[PDB]
Amino acid sequence: DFPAGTTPNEHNINGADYPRIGEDRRVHFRIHAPNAQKVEISFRGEMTKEADGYWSLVSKEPEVIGFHYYQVIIDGVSAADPNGKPFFGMGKWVSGIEIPEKGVDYYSIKNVPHGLISQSWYYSDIRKEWRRCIVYTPAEYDKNPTKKYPVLYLQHGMGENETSWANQGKMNFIMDNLIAEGKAKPMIVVMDNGNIEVFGAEFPAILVNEIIPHIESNFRTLTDRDNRAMAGLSWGGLLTFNTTLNNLDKFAYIGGFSGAGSIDLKQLDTVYGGVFKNRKAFNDKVHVFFLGIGSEEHPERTKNLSDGLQAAGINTIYYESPGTAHEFLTWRRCLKEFAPLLFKT
């Protein structure tokens, strides 16, 4: 039937045999479009017209491991693949290719206790609208009815929304596996909408004045700064820097995944209103200051920032994801590196 060495893409709907992934990491696309003049796949050019009204396309070169957004393009009109499950990225609902990694399973479903992923609604006076956040509770949450948990606030990038970390980021299985293996503390994770679907400038006030009170009123949480963390990817990492460094009374852990605020080391003593000027005071308040980056997305700026902070006396953790770029596998790996560091003082 199918080309040798291929399996259906993980994110196909049930019953969809294409697209398929080869063991050489080439992707095989196939679509029935007898009346179309031209069909393309995003970032891959034109498909080849086949007999019986079909079009086909196989990657010219092996694709990079990990998760990639795509759309089908019919005579210039881009749309989600009808054979695909939906992912919110690039500002709309699109499709996703998954190229598997050999010998890796930390974001896979395993026979371990699984936490819930929950939608929770709250009203924002700042934006005068109802809003939904996505909340991970650990598998043990309901079995420990008197226990309170620390909270990580986890933010997406440009063109994404509050669903992206739990869907293409696979964060619930990453947390499930880390907690089951004893590597991370049981924790609540809250994912909200930066409103940057396409500058998010309202989000810090929404998070501090609306989201945090909502979560603490409706989930069993520890509410002191030593039990509150924040991390974000891409533009969400800049939101995290701006939110945390201006609210150190509420956050003791900071993570930027391919993101980060602009810190000019020449201005280290004055940026963010002088928060870094007394080095040990800052280090005593922020237990984890994490900078992650992909090796293939020009890590030099991030590494120079980390090395320069360290040389000047501000502690950091630098993590470089080998072989990935500005893509979700980078951020899956960042979470896997960052979450085990939290809430262990």
Side-chain angles (χ1 to χ4, degrees), residues 10 21-23 25 63-68 98-108 170 174 319 321-324 328-334 336:
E10 174 188 344
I21 316 299
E23 70 165 55
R25 294 185 287 123
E63 308 226 350
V64 176
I65 53 170
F67 176 89
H68 310 286
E98 188 87 47
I99 307 293
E101 304 181 78
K102 303 177 287 184
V104 173
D105 66 4
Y106 68 89
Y107 48 75
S108 300
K170 287 181 181 293
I174 298 177
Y319 170 66
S321 166
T324 62
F328 246 97
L329 182 60
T330 300
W331 306 324
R332 292 179 189 168
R333 286 166 173 191
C334 283
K336 175 258 296 175

PDB file of all heavy atoms in Angstrom, residues 10 21-23 25 63-68 98-108 170 174 319 321-324 328-334 336:
ATOM      1  N   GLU A  10       1.634  11.522  13.409  1.00  0.00           N
ATOM      2  CA  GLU A  10       0.975  11.397  14.705  1.00  0.00           C
ATOM      3  C   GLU A  10      -0.263  12.277  14.822  1.00  0.00           C
ATOM      4  O   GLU A  10      -1.228  11.897  15.497  1.00  0.00           O
ATOM      5  CB  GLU A  10       1.958  11.757  15.826  1.00  0.00           C
ATOM      6  CG  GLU A  10       1.333  11.787  17.211  1.00  0.00           C
ATOM      7  CD  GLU A  10       2.285  12.328  18.285  1.00  0.00           C
ATOM      8  OE1 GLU A  10       3.500  12.400  18.025  1.00  0.00           O
ATOM      9  OE2 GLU A  10       1.810  12.682  19.388  1.00  0.00           O
ATOM     10  N   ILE A  21       5.215   9.858   7.669  1.00  0.00           N
ATOM     11  CA  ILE A  21       6.595  10.166   8.015  1.00  0.00           C
ATOM     12  C   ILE A  21       7.454   8.957   7.675  1.00  0.00           C
ATOM     13  O   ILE A  21       7.156   7.838   8.109  1.00  0.00           O
ATOM     14  CB  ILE A  21       6.752  10.513   9.507  1.00  0.00           C
ATOM     15  CG1 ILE A  21       5.637  11.461   9.988  1.00  0.00           C
ATOM     16  CG2 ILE A  21       8.186  11.038   9.779  1.00  0.00           C
ATOM     17  CD1 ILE A  21       5.608  12.777   9.279  1.00  0.00           C
ATOM     18  N   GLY A  22       8.524   9.182   6.914  1.00  0.00           N
ATOM     19  CA  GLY A  22       9.457   8.111   6.608  1.00  0.00           C
ATOM     20  C   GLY A  22      10.543   7.960   7.664  1.00  0.00           C
ATOM     21  O   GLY A  22      10.843   8.874   8.430  1.00  0.00           O
ATOM     22  N   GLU A  23      11.158   6.778   7.718  1.00  0.00           N
ATOM     23  CA  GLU A  23      12.246   6.642   8.674  1.00  0.00           C
ATOM     24  C   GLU A  23      13.471   7.445   8.245  1.00  0.00           C
ATOM     25  O   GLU A  23      14.324   7.732   9.086  1.00  0.00           O
ATOM     26  CB  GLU A  23      12.587   5.168   8.930  1.00  0.00           C
ATOM     27  CG  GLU A  23      13.244   4.410   7.816  1.00  0.00           C
ATOM     28  CD  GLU A  23      13.854   3.092   8.310  1.00  0.00           C
ATOM     29  OE1 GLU A  23      13.119   2.280   8.926  1.00  0.00           O
ATOM     30  OE2 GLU A  23      15.072   2.882   8.094  1.00  0.00           O
ATOM     31  N   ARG A  25      13.091  10.485   7.616  1.00  0.00           N
ATOM     32  CA  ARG A  25      12.582  11.785   8.063  1.00  0.00           C
ATOM     33  C   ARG A  25      12.061  12.648   6.920  1.00  0.00           C
ATOM     34  O   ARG A  25      11.913  13.865   7.082  1.00  0.00           O
ATOM     35  CB  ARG A  25      13.637  12.558   8.880  1.00  0.00           C
ATOM     36  CG  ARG A  25      13.984  11.877  10.210  1.00  0.00           C
ATOM     37  CD  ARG A  25      14.938  12.700  11.071  1.00  0.00           C
ATOM     38  NE  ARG A  25      16.291  12.683  10.531  1.00  0.00           N
ATOM     39  CZ  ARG A  25      16.985  13.763  10.189  1.00  0.00           C
ATOM     40  NH1 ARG A  25      16.470  14.971  10.349  1.00  0.00           N
ATOM     41  NH2 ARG A  25      18.208  13.633   9.699  1.00  0.00           N
ATOM     42  N   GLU A  63      13.731  16.025   6.960  1.00  0.00           N
ATOM     43  CA  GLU A  63      13.287  17.148   7.770  1.00  0.00           C
ATOM     44  C   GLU A  63      13.888  17.069   9.177  1.00  0.00           C
ATOM     45  O   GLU A  63      14.328  16.010   9.639  1.00  0.00           O
ATOM     46  CB  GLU A  63      11.757  17.185   7.818  1.00  0.00           C
ATOM     47  CG  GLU A  63      11.145  17.136   6.405  1.00  0.00           C
ATOM     48  CD  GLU A  63      10.030  18.151   6.192  1.00  0.00           C
ATOM     49  OE1 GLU A  63       9.596  18.755   7.191  1.00  0.00           O
ATOM     50  OE2 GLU A  63       9.587  18.334   5.028  1.00  0.00           O
ATOM     51  N   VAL A  64      13.928  18.225   9.849  1.00  0.00           N
ATOM     52  CA  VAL A  64      14.465  18.303  11.205  1.00  0.00           C
ATOM     53  C   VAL A  64      13.522  17.615  12.186  1.00  0.00           C
ATOM     54  O   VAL A  64      12.297  17.724  12.079  1.00  0.00           O
ATOM     55  CB  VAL A  64      14.690  19.771  11.602  1.00  0.00           C
ATOM     56  CG1 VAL A  64      15.158  19.859  13.048  1.00  0.00           C
ATOM     57  CG2 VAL A  64      15.701  20.417  10.668  1.00  0.00           C
ATOM     58  N   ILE A  65      14.095  16.913  13.165  1.00  0.00           N
ATOM     59  CA  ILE A  65      13.303  16.298  14.227  1.00  0.00           C
ATOM     60  C   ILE A  65      12.390  17.330  14.884  1.00  0.00           C
ATOM     61  O   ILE A  65      12.729  18.516  14.973  1.00  0.00           O
ATOM     62  CB  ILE A  65      14.214  15.641  15.280  1.00  0.00           C
ATOM     63  CG1 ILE A  65      15.253  16.653  15.780  1.00  0.00           C
ATOM     64  CG2 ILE A  65      14.904  14.384  14.698  1.00  0.00           C
ATOM     65  CD1 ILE A  65      16.026  16.179  16.979  1.00  0.00           C
ATOM     66  N   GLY A  66      11.242  16.888  15.374  1.00  0.00           N
ATOM     67  CA  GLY A  66      10.384  17.740  16.166  1.00  0.00           C
ATOM     68  C   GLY A  66       9.083  18.096  15.471  1.00  0.00           C
ATOM     69  O   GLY A  66       8.610  17.410  14.562  1.00  0.00           O
ATOM     70  N   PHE A  67       8.497  19.204  15.922  1.00  0.00           N
ATOM     71  CA  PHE A  67       7.146  19.618  15.548  1.00  0.00           C
ATOM     72  C   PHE A  67       7.218  20.812  14.606  1.00  0.00           C
ATOM     73  O   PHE A  67       7.942  21.773  14.884  1.00  0.00           O
ATOM     74  CB  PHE A  67       6.333  19.980  16.798  1.00  0.00           C
ATOM     75  CG  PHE A  67       4.975  20.510  16.479  1.00  0.00           C
ATOM     76  CD1 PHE A  67       3.893  19.649  16.351  1.00  0.00           C
ATOM     77  CD2 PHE A  67       4.788  21.859  16.254  1.00  0.00           C
ATOM     78  CE1 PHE A  67       2.624  20.146  16.024  1.00  0.00           C
ATOM     79  CE2 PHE A  67       3.535  22.350  15.917  1.00  0.00           C
ATOM     80  CZ  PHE A  67       2.460  21.488  15.798  1.00  0.00           C
ATOM     81  N   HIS A  68       6.449  20.770  13.508  1.00  0.00           N
ATOM     82  CA  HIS A  68       6.440  21.856  12.525  1.00  0.00           C
ATOM     83  C   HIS A  68       5.011  22.178  12.086  1.00  0.00           C
ATOM     84  O   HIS A  68       4.265  21.264  11.740  1.00  0.00           O
ATOM     85  CB  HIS A  68       7.270  21.472  11.302  1.00  0.00           C
ATOM     86  CG  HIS A  68       8.624  20.950  11.658  1.00  0.00           C
ATOM     87  ND1 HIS A  68       9.637  21.770  12.102  1.00  0.00           N
ATOM     88  CD2 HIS A  68       9.113  19.689  11.699  1.00  0.00           C
ATOM     89  CE1 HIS A  68      10.708  21.041  12.368  1.00  0.00           C
ATOM     90  NE2 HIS A  68      10.418  19.775  12.122  1.00  0.00           N
ATOM     91  N   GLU A  98       4.860  15.914  12.917  1.00  0.00           N
ATOM     92  CA  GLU A  98       5.758  15.491  13.995  1.00  0.00           C
ATOM     93  C   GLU A  98       6.785  14.502  13.455  1.00  0.00           C
ATOM     94  O   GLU A  98       6.415  13.411  13.010  1.00  0.00           O
ATOM     95  CB  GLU A  98       4.957  14.879  15.147  1.00  0.00           C
ATOM     96  CG  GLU A  98       5.752  14.561  16.411  1.00  0.00           C
ATOM     97  CD  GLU A  98       5.858  15.738  17.379  1.00  0.00           C
ATOM     98  OE1 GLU A  98       4.833  16.408  17.676  1.00  0.00           O
ATOM     99  OE2 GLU A  98       6.984  15.996  17.846  1.00  0.00           O
ATOM    100  N   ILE A  99       8.061  14.882  13.487  1.00  0.00           N
ATOM    101  CA  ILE A  99       9.169  14.008  13.087  1.00  0.00           C
ATOM    102  C   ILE A  99       9.730  13.370  14.350  1.00  0.00           C
ATOM    103  O   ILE A  99      10.314  14.080  15.188  1.00  0.00           O
ATOM    104  CB  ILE A  99      10.261  14.779  12.331  1.00  0.00           C
ATOM    105  CG1 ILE A  99       9.684  15.563  11.148  1.00  0.00           C
ATOM    106  CG2 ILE A  99      11.377  13.824  11.861  1.00  0.00           C
ATOM    107  CD1 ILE A  99       9.143  14.703  10.048  1.00  0.00           C
ATOM    108  N   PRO A 100       9.596  12.059  14.538  1.00  0.00           N
ATOM    109  CA  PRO A 100      10.004  11.433  15.807  1.00  0.00           C
ATOM    110  C   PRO A 100      11.510  11.442  16.030  1.00  0.00           C
ATOM    111  O   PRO A 100      12.302  11.451  15.084  1.00  0.00           O
ATOM    112  CB  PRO A 100       9.495   9.991  15.673  1.00  0.00           C
ATOM    113  CG  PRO A 100       8.472  10.037  14.560  1.00  0.00           C
ATOM    114  CD  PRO A 100       8.945  11.103  13.626  1.00  0.00           C
ATOM    115  N   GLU A 101      11.889  11.417  17.316  1.00  0.00           N
ATOM    116  CA  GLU A 101      13.264  11.234  17.768  1.00  0.00           C
ATOM    117  C   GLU A 101      13.490   9.799  18.228  1.00  0.00           C
ATOM    118  O   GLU A 101      12.678   9.235  18.970  1.00  0.00           O
ATOM    119  CB  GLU A 101      13.607  12.155  18.942  1.00  0.00           C
ATOM    120  CG  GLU A 101      13.401  13.637  18.739  1.00  0.00           C
ATOM    121  CD  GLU A 101      13.812  14.417  19.974  1.00  0.00           C
ATOM    122  OE1 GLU A 101      15.034  14.619  20.174  1.00  0.00           O
ATOM    123  OE2 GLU A 101      12.920  14.791  20.762  1.00  0.00           O
ATOM    124  N   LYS A 102      14.627   9.235  17.837  1.00  0.00           N
ATOM    125  CA  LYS A 102      14.980   7.898  18.291  1.00  0.00           C
ATOM    126  C   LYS A 102      15.407   7.924  19.757  1.00  0.00           C
ATOM    127  O   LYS A 102      16.204   8.773  20.171  1.00  0.00           O
ATOM    128  CB  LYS A 102      16.095   7.335  17.415  1.00  0.00           C
ATOM    129  CG  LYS A 102      15.733   7.307  15.937  1.00  0.00           C
ATOM    130  CD  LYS A 102      16.879   6.809  15.064  1.00  0.00           C
ATOM    131  CE  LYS A 102      17.988   7.848  14.952  1.00  0.00           C
ATOM    132  NZ  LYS A 102      19.075   7.413  14.027  1.00  0.00           N
ATOM    133  N   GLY A 103      14.862   6.997  20.546  1.00  0.00           N
ATOM    134  CA  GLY A 103      15.289   6.844  21.927  1.00  0.00           C
ATOM    135  C   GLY A 103      14.914   7.975  22.862  1.00  0.00           C
ATOM    136  O   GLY A 103      15.626   8.223  23.843  1.00  0.00           O
ATOM    137  N   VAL A 104      13.817   8.677  22.585  1.00  0.00           N
ATOM    138  CA  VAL A 104      13.353   9.779  23.418  1.00  0.00           C
ATOM    139  C   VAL A 104      11.895   9.524  23.765  1.00  0.00           C
ATOM    140  O   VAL A 104      11.084   9.253  22.873  1.00  0.00           O
ATOM    141  CB  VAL A 104      13.509  11.137  22.703  1.00  0.00           C
ATOM    142  CG1 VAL A 104      12.864  12.247  23.514  1.00  0.00           C
ATOM    143  CG2 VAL A 104      14.979  11.433  22.451  1.00  0.00           C
ATOM    144  N   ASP A 105      11.550   9.633  25.050  1.00  0.00           N
ATOM    145  CA  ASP A 105      10.153   9.426  25.416  1.00  0.00           C
ATOM    146  C   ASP A 105       9.628  10.348  26.518  1.00  0.00           C
ATOM    147  O   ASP A 105       8.530  10.096  27.029  1.00  0.00           O
ATOM    148  CB  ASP A 105       9.936   7.958  25.822  1.00  0.00           C
ATOM    149  CG  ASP A 105      10.672   7.584  27.096  1.00  0.00           C
ATOM    150  OD1 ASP A 105      11.291   8.463  27.725  1.00  0.00           O
ATOM    151  OD2 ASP A 105      10.627   6.398  27.478  1.00  0.00           O
ATOM    152  N   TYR A 106      10.336  11.424  26.886  1.00  0.00           N
ATOM    153  CA  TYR A 106       9.878  12.222  28.024  1.00  0.00           C
ATOM    154  C   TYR A 106       8.617  13.039  27.719  1.00  0.00           C
ATOM    155  O   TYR A 106       7.947  13.475  28.658  1.00  0.00           O
ATOM    156  CB  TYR A 106      10.998  13.147  28.538  1.00  0.00           C
ATOM    157  CG  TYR A 106      11.352  14.246  27.574  1.00  0.00           C
ATOM    158  CD1 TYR A 106      10.687  15.471  27.616  1.00  0.00           C
ATOM    159  CD2 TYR A 106      12.326  14.053  26.597  1.00  0.00           C
ATOM    160  CE1 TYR A 106      10.993  16.475  26.721  1.00  0.00           C
ATOM    161  CE2 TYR A 106      12.635  15.049  25.696  1.00  0.00           C
ATOM    162  CZ  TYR A 106      11.965  16.257  25.765  1.00  0.00           C
ATOM    163  OH  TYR A 106      12.249  17.258  24.864  1.00  0.00           O
ATOM    164  N   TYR A 107       8.262  13.255  26.448  1.00  0.00           N
ATOM    165  CA  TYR A 107       6.986  13.901  26.134  1.00  0.00           C
ATOM    166  C   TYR A 107       5.940  12.918  25.606  1.00  0.00           C
ATOM    167  O   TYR A 107       4.915  13.347  25.054  1.00  0.00           O
ATOM    168  CB  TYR A 107       7.176  15.066  25.152  1.00  0.00           C
ATOM    169  CG  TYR A 107       8.029  14.761  23.937  1.00  0.00           C
ATOM    170  CD1 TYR A 107       7.533  14.003  22.878  1.00  0.00           C
ATOM    171  CD2 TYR A 107       9.330  15.256  23.842  1.00  0.00           C
ATOM    172  CE1 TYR A 107       8.332  13.725  21.753  1.00  0.00           C
ATOM    173  CE2 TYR A 107      10.134  14.989  22.730  1.00  0.00           C
ATOM    174  CZ  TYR A 107       9.633  14.226  21.688  1.00  0.00           C
ATOM    175  OH  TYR A 107      10.446  13.954  20.592  1.00  0.00           O
ATOM    176  N   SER A 108       6.158  11.621  25.790  1.00  0.00           N
ATOM    177  CA  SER A 108       5.237  10.587  25.332  1.00  0.00           C
ATOM    178  C   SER A 108       4.284  10.161  26.448  1.00  0.00           C
ATOM    179  O   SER A 108       4.538  10.381  27.634  1.00  0.00           O
ATOM    180  CB  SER A 108       6.017   9.371  24.826  1.00  0.00           C
ATOM    181  OG  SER A 108       6.866   9.741  23.754  1.00  0.00           O
ATOM    182  N   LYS A 170       2.910  19.681  24.318  1.00  0.00           N
ATOM    183  CA  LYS A 170       2.851  18.385  25.002  1.00  0.00           C
ATOM    184  C   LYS A 170       3.166  18.509  26.492  1.00  0.00           C
ATOM    185  O   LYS A 170       3.650  17.560  27.122  1.00  0.00           O
ATOM    186  CB  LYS A 170       3.809  17.379  24.346  1.00  0.00           C
ATOM    187  CG  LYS A 170       3.308  16.877  22.987  1.00  0.00           C
ATOM    188  CD  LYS A 170       4.279  15.870  22.408  1.00  0.00           C
ATOM    189  CE  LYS A 170       3.820  15.368  21.055  1.00  0.00           C
ATOM    190  NZ  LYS A 170       2.585  14.569  21.196  1.00  0.00           N
ATOM    191  N   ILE A 174       5.023  15.928  29.588  1.00  0.00           N
ATOM    192  CA  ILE A 174       6.329  16.293  30.131  1.00  0.00           C
ATOM    193  C   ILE A 174       6.252  16.395  31.653  1.00  0.00           C
ATOM    194  O   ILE A 174       7.088  15.833  32.372  1.00  0.00           O
ATOM    195  CB  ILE A 174       6.820  17.599  29.485  1.00  0.00           C
ATOM    196  CG1 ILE A 174       6.999  17.394  27.984  1.00  0.00           C
ATOM    197  CG2 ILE A 174       8.142  18.059  30.120  1.00  0.00           C
ATOM    198  CD1 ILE A 174       7.425  18.678  27.222  1.00  0.00           C
ATOM    199  N   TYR A 319      20.985  26.932  28.867  1.00  0.00           N
ATOM    200  CA  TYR A 319      20.679  25.655  28.234  1.00  0.00           C
ATOM    201  C   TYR A 319      20.610  25.863  26.728  1.00  0.00           C
ATOM    202  O   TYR A 319      19.875  26.734  26.255  1.00  0.00           O
ATOM    203  CB  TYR A 319      19.352  25.057  28.740  1.00  0.00           C
ATOM    204  CG  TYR A 319      18.951  23.870  27.895  1.00  0.00           C
ATOM    205  CD1 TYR A 319      19.714  22.703  27.902  1.00  0.00           C
ATOM    206  CD2 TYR A 319      17.852  23.935  27.042  1.00  0.00           C
ATOM    207  CE1 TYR A 319      19.376  21.623  27.103  1.00  0.00           C
ATOM    208  CE2 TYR A 319      17.506  22.855  26.242  1.00  0.00           C
ATOM    209  CZ  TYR A 319      18.275  21.712  26.273  1.00  0.00           C
ATOM    210  OH  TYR A 319      17.941  20.644  25.478  1.00  0.00           O
ATOM    211  N   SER A 321      19.737  23.855  23.200  1.00  0.00           N
ATOM    212  CA  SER A 321      19.105  22.658  22.645  1.00  0.00           C
ATOM    213  C   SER A 321      19.814  22.256  21.356  1.00  0.00           C
ATOM    214  O   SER A 321      19.765  23.000  20.370  1.00  0.00           O
ATOM    215  CB  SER A 321      17.618  22.915  22.372  1.00  0.00           C
ATOM    216  OG  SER A 321      17.070  21.891  21.560  1.00  0.00           O
ATOM    217  N   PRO A 322      20.469  21.096  21.312  1.00  0.00           N
ATOM    218  CA  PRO A 322      21.300  20.770  20.141  1.00  0.00           C
ATOM    219  C   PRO A 322      20.448  20.414  18.930  1.00  0.00           C
ATOM    220  O   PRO A 322      19.548  19.575  19.006  1.00  0.00           O
ATOM    221  CB  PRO A 322      22.136  19.579  20.620  1.00  0.00           C
ATOM    222  CG  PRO A 322      21.305  18.953  21.690  1.00  0.00           C
ATOM    223  CD  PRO A 322      20.531  20.057  22.351  1.00  0.00           C
ATOM    224  N   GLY A 323      20.728  21.077  17.809  1.00  0.00           N
ATOM    225  CA  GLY A 323      20.118  20.719  16.543  1.00  0.00           C
ATOM    226  C   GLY A 323      18.730  21.268  16.263  1.00  0.00           C
ATOM    227  O   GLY A 323      18.132  20.879  15.255  1.00  0.00           O
ATOM    228  N   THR A 324      18.197  22.161  17.100  1.00  0.00           N
ATOM    229  CA  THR A 324      16.867  22.727  16.884  1.00  0.00           C
ATOM    230  C   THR A 324      16.947  24.250  16.806  1.00  0.00           C
ATOM    231  O   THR A 324      17.942  24.859  17.210  1.00  0.00           O
ATOM    232  CB  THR A 324      15.887  22.327  17.999  1.00  0.00           C
ATOM    233  OG1 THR A 324      16.352  22.849  19.255  1.00  0.00           O
ATOM    234  CG2 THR A 324      15.782  20.817  18.090  1.00  0.00           C
ATOM    235  N   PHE A 328       9.038  24.293  18.332  1.00  0.00           N
ATOM    236  CA  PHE A 328       8.506  23.823  19.612  1.00  0.00           C
ATOM    237  C   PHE A 328       9.340  22.734  20.281  1.00  0.00           C
ATOM    238  O   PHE A 328       9.274  22.611  21.506  1.00  0.00           O
ATOM    239  CB  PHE A 328       7.061  23.351  19.471  1.00  0.00           C
ATOM    240  CG  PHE A 328       6.113  24.222  20.225  1.00  0.00           C
ATOM    241  CD1 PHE A 328       5.416  25.235  19.579  1.00  0.00           C
ATOM    242  CD2 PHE A 328       5.990  24.090  21.601  1.00  0.00           C
ATOM    243  CE1 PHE A 328       4.587  26.073  20.287  1.00  0.00           C
ATOM    244  CE2 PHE A 328       5.140  24.933  22.317  1.00  0.00           C
ATOM    245  CZ  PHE A 328       4.448  25.914  21.654  1.00  0.00           C
ATOM    246  N   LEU A 329      10.120  21.936  19.542  1.00  0.00           N
ATOM    247  CA  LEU A 329      10.955  20.961  20.241  1.00  0.00           C
ATOM    248  C   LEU A 329      11.984  21.654  21.128  1.00  0.00           C
ATOM    249  O   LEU A 329      12.302  21.157  22.216  1.00  0.00           O
ATOM    250  CB  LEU A 329      11.647  20.017  19.249  1.00  0.00           C
ATOM    251  CG  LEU A 329      12.525  18.916  19.893  1.00  0.00           C
ATOM    252  CD1 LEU A 329      11.707  18.010  20.817  1.00  0.00           C
ATOM    253  CD2 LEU A 329      13.189  18.074  18.819  1.00  0.00           C
ATOM    254  N   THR A 330      12.506  22.806  20.692  1.00  0.00           N
ATOM    255  CA  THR A 330      13.374  23.596  21.560  1.00  0.00           C
ATOM    256  C   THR A 330      12.698  23.879  22.900  1.00  0.00           C
ATOM    257  O   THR A 330      13.323  23.751  23.967  1.00  0.00           O
ATOM    258  CB  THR A 330      13.752  24.913  20.865  1.00  0.00           C
ATOM    259  OG1 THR A 330      14.442  24.625  19.650  1.00  0.00           O
ATOM    260  CG2 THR A 330      14.667  25.781  21.745  1.00  0.00           C
ATOM    261  N   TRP A 331      11.416  24.250  22.857  1.00  0.00           N
ATOM    262  CA  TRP A 331      10.687  24.693  24.041  1.00  0.00           C
ATOM    263  C   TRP A 331      10.208  23.516  24.876  1.00  0.00           C
ATOM    264  O   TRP A 331      10.172  23.621  26.109  1.00  0.00           O
ATOM    265  CB  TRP A 331       9.533  25.617  23.610  1.00  0.00           C
ATOM    266  CG  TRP A 331      10.116  26.713  22.756  1.00  0.00           C
ATOM    267  CD1 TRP A 331      11.345  27.304  22.934  1.00  0.00           C
ATOM    268  CD2 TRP A 331       9.576  27.274  21.550  1.00  0.00           C
ATOM    269  NE1 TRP A 331      11.577  28.227  21.944  1.00  0.00           N
ATOM    270  CE2 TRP A 331      10.512  28.230  21.079  1.00  0.00           C
ATOM    271  CE3 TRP A 331       8.388  27.087  20.838  1.00  0.00           C
ATOM    272  CZ2 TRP A 331      10.299  28.982  19.923  1.00  0.00           C
ATOM    273  CZ3 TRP A 331       8.173  27.837  19.687  1.00  0.00           C
ATOM    274  CH2 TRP A 331       9.128  28.775  19.242  1.00  0.00           C
ATOM    275  N   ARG A 332       9.877  22.381  24.242  1.00  0.00           N
ATOM    276  CA  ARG A 332       9.656  21.162  25.022  1.00  0.00           C
ATOM    277  C   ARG A 332      10.892  20.816  25.840  1.00  0.00           C
ATOM    278  O   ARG A 332      10.794  20.456  27.023  1.00  0.00           O
ATOM    279  CB  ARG A 332       9.308  19.980  24.110  1.00  0.00           C
ATOM    280  CG  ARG A 332       7.938  20.086  23.396  1.00  0.00           C
ATOM    281  CD  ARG A 332       7.737  18.850  22.504  1.00  0.00           C
ATOM    282  NE  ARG A 332       6.568  18.952  21.617  1.00  0.00           N
ATOM    283  CZ  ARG A 332       6.343  18.113  20.605  1.00  0.00           C
ATOM    284  NH1 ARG A 332       7.207  17.126  20.368  1.00  0.00           N
ATOM    285  NH2 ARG A 332       5.270  18.260  19.827  1.00  0.00           N
ATOM    286  N   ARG A 333      12.067  20.896  25.218  1.00  0.00           N
ATOM    287  CA  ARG A 333      13.298  20.577  25.940  1.00  0.00           C
ATOM    288  C   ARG A 333      13.570  21.588  27.049  1.00  0.00           C
ATOM    289  O   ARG A 333      14.021  21.212  28.136  1.00  0.00           O
ATOM    290  CB  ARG A 333      14.476  20.524  24.972  1.00  0.00           C
ATOM    291  CG  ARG A 333      14.499  19.278  24.085  1.00  0.00           C
ATOM    292  CD  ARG A 333      15.480  19.451  22.935  1.00  0.00           C
ATOM    293  NE  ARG A 333      15.662  18.230  22.143  1.00  0.00           N
ATOM    294  CZ  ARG A 333      16.618  18.077  21.229  1.00  0.00           C
ATOM    295  NH1 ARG A 333      17.477  19.068  20.991  1.00  0.00           N
ATOM    296  NH2 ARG A 333      16.721  16.934  20.552  1.00  0.00           N
ATOM    297  N   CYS A 334      13.342  22.878  26.780  1.00  0.00           N
ATOM    298  CA  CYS A 334      13.520  23.900  27.813  1.00  0.00           C
ATOM    299  C   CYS A 334      12.659  23.603  29.037  1.00  0.00           C
ATOM    300  O   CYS A 334      13.122  23.714  30.177  1.00  0.00           O
ATOM    301  CB  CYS A 334      13.176  25.290  27.264  1.00  0.00           C
ATOM    302  SG  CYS A 334      14.432  26.041  26.215  1.00  0.00           S
ATOM    303  N   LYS A 336      11.507  20.741  30.018  1.00  0.00           N
ATOM    304  CA  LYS A 336      12.059  19.555  30.650  1.00  0.00           C
ATOM    305  C   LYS A 336      13.292  19.891  31.492  1.00  0.00           C
ATOM    306  O   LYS A 336      13.528  19.248  32.524  1.00  0.00           O
ATOM    307  CB  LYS A 336      12.377  18.515  29.563  1.00  0.00           C
ATOM    308  CG  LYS A 336      13.081  17.253  30.040  1.00  0.00           C
ATOM    309  CD  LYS A 336      14.556  17.319  29.721  1.00  0.00           C
ATOM    310  CE  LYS A 336      14.831  17.360  28.217  1.00  0.00           C
ATOM    311  NZ  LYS A 336      16.296  17.537  27.912  1.00  0.00           N
TER     312      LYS A 336
END
